[PDB]
Symmetry: D2
Amino acid sequence: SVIKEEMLIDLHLEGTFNGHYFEIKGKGKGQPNEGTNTVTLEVTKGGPLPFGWHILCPQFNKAFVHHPDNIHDYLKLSFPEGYTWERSMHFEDGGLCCITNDISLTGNCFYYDIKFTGLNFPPNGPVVQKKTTGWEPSTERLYPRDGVLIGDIHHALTVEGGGHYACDIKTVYRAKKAALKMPGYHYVDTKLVIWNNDKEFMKVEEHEIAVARHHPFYEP
Amino acid sequence: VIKEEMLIDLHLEGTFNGHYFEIKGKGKGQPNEGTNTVTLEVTKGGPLPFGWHILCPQFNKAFVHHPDNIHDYLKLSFPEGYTWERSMHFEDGGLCCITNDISLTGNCFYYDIKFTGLNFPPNGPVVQKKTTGWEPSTERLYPRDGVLIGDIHHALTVEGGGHYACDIKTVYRAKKAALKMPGYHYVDTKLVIWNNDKEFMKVEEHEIAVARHHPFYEP
Amino acid sequence: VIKEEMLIDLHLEGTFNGHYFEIKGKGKGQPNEGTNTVTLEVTKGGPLPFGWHILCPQFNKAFVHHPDNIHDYLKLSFPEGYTWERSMHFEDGGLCCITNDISLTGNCFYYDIKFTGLNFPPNGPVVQKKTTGWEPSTERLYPRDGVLIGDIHHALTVEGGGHYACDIKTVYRAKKAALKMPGYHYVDTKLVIWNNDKEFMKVEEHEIAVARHHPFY
Amino acid sequence: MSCSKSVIKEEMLIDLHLEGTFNGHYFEIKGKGKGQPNEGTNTVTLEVTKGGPLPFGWHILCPQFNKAFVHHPDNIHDYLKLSFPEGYTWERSMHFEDGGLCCITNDISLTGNCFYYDIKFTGLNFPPNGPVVQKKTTGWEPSTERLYPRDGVLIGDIHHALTVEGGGHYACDIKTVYRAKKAALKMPGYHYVDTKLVIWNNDKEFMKVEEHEIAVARHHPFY
Ligand code: NA
Ligand code: NA
């Protein structure tokens, strides 16, 4: 297909957090069938950010998920046209993020047009206080509805001094052109880590590994 | 810097269930009368693949009549201005996240609005364009951490009669730290569509709003 | 069915973060005046390991003053009675789920209240007993499917000042189908603790409540 | 050697009582069963004793009818097994995609090899044309709960779903907080429990139901 074993990534993010505007540019490269990708980000406006980097990490494309042959790959099949996703993240202390990405492809490069709004984060929370230290690995549960895919994750940031900061993530993925088939109820396991950052997190390199699977007790 | 009649300039950039759209608008208000009227034009992504009315509240509580005994945090944020950030959770799973950065140059307010609407079901009143307007509302407001938090249990009216409920939280942030803060109080709002074209590409709407204490409030 | 002064007999069974408790009380009210007083005694699992105030609203909107132009769904449910079911989502993740089945025998209302309080954090104002009361409230109510839905953006006051916010939804179900429903409207309520002992084992509380349309109706 | 050491046996019995309301409708259910705590399996048979035939689909009740019956590898601390003989309580919310909300608690105690469940159920705000009231639910998908320790208690969250008649799913976000009655000595870390619950038998009107659960604890696959 148009999905190659190695593909490039060009990212743009415009965001507001507790009313503070910022922009981030990035570029990267991934291995869609291997389920891996690495991106490098640079804050281009509104930096250094007045909140912890890590809530941004999942915003910086589940086309980079390894799919076994018996799970239809809705997102890879959305190309060349592409797809959009829309995400809410409700945090245990009332913080809420609402994020969208419009993903396009030109040549062998994905283009991400990301819009981020973070709101109602308390001033003494781990995000504003920059106390988040990364994400645990996660397992997203996905199911088809109305020709789109809905994924929900019970996820958590790790916090300095040990401990977790829990979040409920919902993502809806919409192929720009009608899918001809849909996967069933399934999961994606993901692990995202920061490889590199400057002290101020103005420049960050991060890596994601992701694999789709059925539940271990699944039956067709 | 707040005058008896002021101008409104606005831009909304938005996404609804992945569909990108832009709206611009202009109008005028009477900040102390608690009234304002805006006219909006869809400039990009029209005609909208959803009912108009969810956008109405997005198109400045500086246009609220305040009595002398309720401190006016938002009017008092100017010249510097304020930002607001709002979530709207609808009874059917639909969610909107909206922001506005309000500035003032001359006697004209500028709204830089960003709208995200997500997870709206295809057969709900929004996508099916079955919303017919808003009920009037009552927002409960309280101070916290030098900012203002307001919550509404609102509802849109729907064609065949009946309501489509929503829970709205707005956080209002002055750009310069406030000297004083208001207490626990309420804003009554009534928003109406004065006119629109068939396809809702141009809409005229009017807002009347008044701040008050609870009827059983004791100083 | 409804008289100018009516008695209240109530029982509450509940758990809060796993801790079982029971409360019994009684009182009286003036359904048309929109007032009622109740006196409660913790009969089981006291002193409660959490602040009293989250329970206050659980201890009958038949005691709301309705003007001539707002159909009184809840008074008109009697003699058969009604049930309500309520959720309270607090800003720190605490959640209460409460039901009440209200019946009428003679002059006296009987409340059978079931309370579950879950996920309240240890350092929050409820567990720490830092709640000092409720603000007055405004419930928005609308009819659907022959039942009444009410929502409140409420708040408890907290020691030292400031508030602890809660979102309350109540669904009120008449036991016999209603041949008349009210429209979109509001109830204004004020609830006060009138007296308590040091450990809140015995509490008296008063409630005034009035229904109305929005001011710009 | 002491009595407390062998409180979890290879085979345990279950005796349960559930009292609940659904959209104001009162009902009671009793049940008995047995399980194999170390194998991660149990089976229970329920009978509706009051307020039946229920005016809603059975399946929302299934997870209410004890994660002591979860297979744990040696490297995941078994908080719930170790809460015994004292036992533990759990408290759960289930927020459904159409606004329906269930709040459920269970106080679990143990005598001999029999667990006793005292279950309290509240189901509210379920729409009249939703799949629960319409009895359109047909069972649960298998699930994966994410668990983490907090303040000496265990918190688990599931993004779960009921299957419904036409094909399709009815999604739910489940939170459970598990509280040992006696303060734990050690806590597990961030981990998962995979569960599959199925109906094994039922009568027409679901007045009597046999259901079976298998559950296994594990770390994330990439762990
Ligand atoms: Na809410
Ligand atoms: Na949730």
